[PDB]
Amino acid sequence: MTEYKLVVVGAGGVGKSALTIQLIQNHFVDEYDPTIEDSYRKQVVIDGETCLLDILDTAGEESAMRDQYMRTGEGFLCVFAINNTKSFEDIHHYREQIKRVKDSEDVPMVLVGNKCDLPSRTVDTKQAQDLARSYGIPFIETSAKTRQGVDDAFYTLVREIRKH
Numbered sequence: 609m610t611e612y613k614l615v616v617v618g619a620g621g622v623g624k625s626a627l628t629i630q631l632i633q634n635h636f637v638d639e640y641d642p643t644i645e646d647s648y649r650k651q652v653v654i655d656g657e658t659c660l661l662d663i664l665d666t667a668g669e670e671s672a673m674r675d676q677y678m679r680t681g682e683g684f685l686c687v688f689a690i691n692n693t694k695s696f697e698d699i700h701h702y703r704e705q706i707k708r709v710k711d712s713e714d715v716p717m718v719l720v721g722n723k724c725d726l727p728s729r730t731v732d733t734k735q736a737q738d739l740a741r742s743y744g745i746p747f748i749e750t751s752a753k754t755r756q757g758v759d760d761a762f763y764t765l766v767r768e769i770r771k772h
């Protein structure tokens with residue numbers, strides 16, 4: 609079946625691991641080693657197409673797998689936490705890294721505002737929508753805890769990859 613190679617990036621603590629594990633096995637993880645970087649594969653059906661999502665959950669330092677995923681990844685989830693202003697301000701660094709390593713101005717990407725269940729929002733929805741518009745990319749609000757938007761985030765990224 610078709611495989612889509614996806615990479616999850618963003619500041620420490622924004623919920624990259626929790627979003628990945630919620631997608632993979634439908635559970636919310638309260639604590640996941642901030643240094644563990646692993647890849648996961650899930651069969652899904654997106655717009656009728658049975659396919660494999662091949663996901664690297666990046667973490668942190670100098671690996672062969674991470675280098676290969678950055679170079680050959682087909683699409684990137686750029687994650688910030690809606691209660692962490694710095695993580696949102698850091699988003700442009702991750703986008704720039706992707707453009708540099710891919711040597712391309714046109715890389716499939718989705719902006720993800722995670723932790724939307726929390727009572728501590730400091731990044732307005734419109735603020736992130738405005739950023740995504742300037743980048744020309746989709747924006748999806750998610751919660752790895754409630755599952756809001758989790759499938760939508762990954763599936764939207766697949767649909768962006770398909771356009772490439």
Ligand SMILES: Nc1nc2c(ncn2[C@@H]2O[C@H](COP(=O)(O)OP(=O)(O)O)[C@@H](O)[C@H]2O)c(=O)[nH]1
Nearest residue numbers: 620621622623624625626637638723751752753
């Ligand atoms: N309430 C809430 N907590 C979350 C969400 N996503 C992640 N977390 C918590 O945020 C902390 C950091 O998440 P983690 O997945 O390790 O972040 P990572 O460093 O980007 O991999 C953990 O305690 C998670 O349980 C969310 O959508 N809602």
Ligand SMILES: [Mg+2]
Nearest residue numbers: 624625642667
């Ligand atoms: Mg992690």
